[PDB]
Amino acid sequence: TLIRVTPEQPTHAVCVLGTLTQLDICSSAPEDCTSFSINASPGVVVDIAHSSTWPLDPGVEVTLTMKVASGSTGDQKVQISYYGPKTPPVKALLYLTGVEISLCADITRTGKVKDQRTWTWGPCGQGAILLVNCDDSEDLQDMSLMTLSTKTPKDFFTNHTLVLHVARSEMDKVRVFQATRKCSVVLGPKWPSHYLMVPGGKHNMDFYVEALAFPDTDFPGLITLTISLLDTSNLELPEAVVFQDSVVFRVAPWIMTPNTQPPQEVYACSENEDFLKSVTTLAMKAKCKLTICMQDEMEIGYIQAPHKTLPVVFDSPMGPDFGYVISGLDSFGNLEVSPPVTVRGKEYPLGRILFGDSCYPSNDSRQMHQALQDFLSAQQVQAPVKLYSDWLSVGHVDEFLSFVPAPDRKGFRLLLASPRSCYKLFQEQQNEGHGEALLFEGIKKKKQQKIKNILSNKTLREHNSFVERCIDWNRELLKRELGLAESDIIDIPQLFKLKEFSKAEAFFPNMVNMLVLGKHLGIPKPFGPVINGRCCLEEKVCSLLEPLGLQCTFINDFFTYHIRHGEVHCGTNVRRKPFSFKWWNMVP
Amino acid sequence: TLIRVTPEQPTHAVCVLGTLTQLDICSSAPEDCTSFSINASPGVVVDIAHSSTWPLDPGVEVTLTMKVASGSTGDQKVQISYYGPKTPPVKALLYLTGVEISLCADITRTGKVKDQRTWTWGPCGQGAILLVNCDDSEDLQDMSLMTLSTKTPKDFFTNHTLVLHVARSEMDKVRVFQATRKCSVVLGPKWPSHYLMVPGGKHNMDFYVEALAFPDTDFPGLITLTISLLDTSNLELPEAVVFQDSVVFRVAPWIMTPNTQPPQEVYACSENEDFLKSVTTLAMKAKCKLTICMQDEMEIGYIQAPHKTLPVVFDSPMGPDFGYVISGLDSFGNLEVSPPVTVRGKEYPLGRILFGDSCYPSNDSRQMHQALQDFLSAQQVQAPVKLYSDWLSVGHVDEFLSFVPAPDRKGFRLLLASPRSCYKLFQEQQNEGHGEALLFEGIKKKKQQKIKNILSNKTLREHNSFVERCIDWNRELLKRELGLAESDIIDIPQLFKLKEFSKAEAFFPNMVNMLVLGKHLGIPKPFGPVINGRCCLEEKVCSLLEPLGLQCTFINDFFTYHIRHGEVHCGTNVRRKPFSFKWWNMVP
């Protein structure tokens, strides 16, 4: 893309509109002559940087611009006169053929097709987004548009030829279809390059692009597609590259919705009892859709481009929504996301994903499978945070933490399970004489217990006092990585037993692990000591939550054992409104 | 690491120096009382943020600091008085044991052991560097020092215990030895955690750390080592984490030395003839060491930490230096690095690595193995640049480009092979009547050729005219990615034949692919047409280079065919001075 002119022969060149072209005016000059000048046909725009006159100084820098594409091979002309003290002007002729080759996608991020060949984050960055095909004129409504607009002479592709191509390293992560009034595969796995059939004149060409893989440990998540122009005139010699333009795509990451995000649909596909009633009552009250046909073993996120926002469900290691993609800590039981937070400056507008882990890796210690941890980080926009959960028998963060919408402060509360909270309440009672009150009243199969005989236990007080620490550790972890003050955290009274290998389960139905449908909470009925005909525990949950403006509804049968994989399981799940904020306008 | 005080019992806590500790003054308070005050023993430093008085407002934020470590369990005391309108002061006692746990490496990057747990690039970033063990009290001179300084009561580790640990994801990329006046493996592959034997009082402990893997596609190149403090007092319950500190290490990348870098040793281990003489003459003249015992199939780089700079030789897919680590484009023939460049602002002080590739991937097209391309990028500091070389039969960038030191401008010249340069010279001659001059004079086995009969060839003029394009394409690629002006580029006259499958070899010994020893150039003797007893070609090389102050010495037998892997091969190699500039002070 530098042109060398000889006064010997006339040189012919092609010129893509929008390309600074340098002129070697010097290499083949006569030394009889000292200086030169540059006349050109009206449609060409010479810019000499150091009528007119100039010295033959090799330091001078003549550049060519073409205004409009040619209608004819060589219909624009550049003449170099080489004159000097007494050595008449020698001419050197350049016949230019201008052509428009512009390859475009939605780099502006506005659902209309319009910088560098680099993808930039944020409100003023450039880069088209690609959604993952998660298994025409309706299928193409998910795929991203990319058009090749070309103006050239009728004759042009007689001895020129375009080829679209993708790095053999990215071909298996993209598929490209060429539209035809009706589509066909040009690029994808096993095909990294394609020769285009393009006619002369003004022809624009529509391609539809889907991604095949999410970002991950082996894919930073960019697919560059390049158009190359090739000279095929010398018939015996191989193709000569004249020109390359490209578009960088960024594959949209998988994003999760916190409980603070308004609900859109509740899934209760889970046997059943009067639970389904108390759910449909809270679903009606929540002005939210309810369905029936496990929920604990999968998580409904979304993927988002300017042109489409689609719900995608990630299934933990089937007729629900539309879009799908071993340790006890590999479950999505062990996967929450915070609400939008800011932390010491850095901003996290789609929140931060939280997942349970150990403190340090021993031979008696469990972690989430590295493969998952890396995948979540790959998505970048929800900077995962590693919490301590291995102390629990099951090992899930949803066992001791939750979020609920608040009106004031940061517009949310962190709910942490709290043995102390429950103890201070249980004894405050003994002091008022209700020490005789029986926890587990109205229960088919459970040995009932009095406040007194629970408080008077020394073995329990410690077990719970140890759990206090385990949570109080995550309390700080959360306070730091989500940038929280105590005035953002609410302690829900909750006790624990330590079963096999000193591991922890909730002592009574785990009230923190609730159903948030905006301001309408489905809390697991603790079935606790009743005092003056009101479950002491229900009272304190409602006293900590109703002030926030949250409708607390305690539901029986909230969890359930099963036969195979035998495990306690929540039966509900909630598709929620995707963030207004566009993932591609943040800055990791 | 929040402490809750009850007026019921006295609470005991440990406190690591340098840790803001929060006091829950409120959860277990009496409601008979309205306000509180905080007296403490001289060595503790309370900071109440909202003698003294304060309201019991849960919004208040009492924080604990300890000055010096304790000599005795609980030798520092905090008392919380809860007083009110007519409700005498109730006390709540806190017995604090202060301890120093500080884990340190060379985070300052100064070869002395002294922010966050994050590695930062540049002149004011923090992060210790780790060199790769590339196969005592001399072995440890390569390894990085990390010390655990602890001051505690004599009694302290009776019911506390430290453990050093590395993410199971990074254990196979690090090895950690514990010194003993004498060393042993604490952490590495198959061991992610270690219990430390630490005594009470002031004890500091030396660990030596080596990396086992360079950064690569599956390793961003950081090794975090964490120290955890564990409470082992409750004997029946599991260990409780009280405290964690960590050091992030960055594994030093493999770096290459351009020709602009002063030579330190020449390797001519390569049979031989009078070549070895003409080399030792240029080596003596270059005040540079020469050795004898292939050079084309490996590349001497370096790895660099504050405490050690070591030469490492990367071997392309043996008794030379010290430190080691299929397509025709996988060779290091196809691997140069530019000199230090700046490009449109962005700065590249260790230069940029250049490697040959195709334009677009066809079924008749060769690329460097993705595995290598990714490795070079992994090292980050020399942002690889992809050039067009597949047009050449062998396919190596060193076939058409080189660099040499200059005094002025950017302190270097890009040397590009140039058919035009050679043609303008070859004909300028015919014009002066030496058209009869025979190229390949004094050659045992080669059919000689006259300027006239080379110029009068139409088949050659084109072949060479096609190569011109191929290079003129890299000319622009180089001009853009290395940010160059024509006044940085020198054209060396060089012609080509196109052998099998229209591929290119040098028509005469490839003069651009020379031996740079600072200002002393070993150029391959072109064996070209002699005019007035001086090889026309030698004249023009020297006319383009001697002005720069470069001593041009044309060497016979510079390349050589072999038996197995039968291929043309340069026999020399050059270990060069590593950059003064520290890779860890740049910013990718």
Ligand SMILES: Cc1c(-c2cc3ccccc3n2Cc2ccc(F)cc2)nc2cc(C(=O)N3CCC[C@@H](N)C3)ccn12
């Ligand atoms: C022992 C236990 C309890 C609980 C303690 C208890 C005591 C008596 C009666 C019911 C009791 N119940 C209710 C229940 C219901 C039916 C049944 F057969 C088993 C458990 N409540 C929870 C909640 C959780 C929790 O939060 N998770 C469930 C596991 C998967 C995690 N992802 C989420 C974990 C353990 N729990």
Ligand SMILES: Cc1c(-c2cc3ccccc3n2Cc2ccc(F)cc2)nc2cc(C(=O)N3CCC[C@@H](N)C3)ccn12
């Ligand atoms: C055909 C050729 C020539 C050349 C052309 C030529 C013509 C006549 C005589 C000698 C000639 N010679 C000299 C030579 C020497 C001995 C021998 F048996 C083969 C080639 N000179 C080069 C230099 C290069 C080059 O730059 N490379 C070598 C390959 C590996 C690359 N990494 C670097 C490549 C091909 N060449």
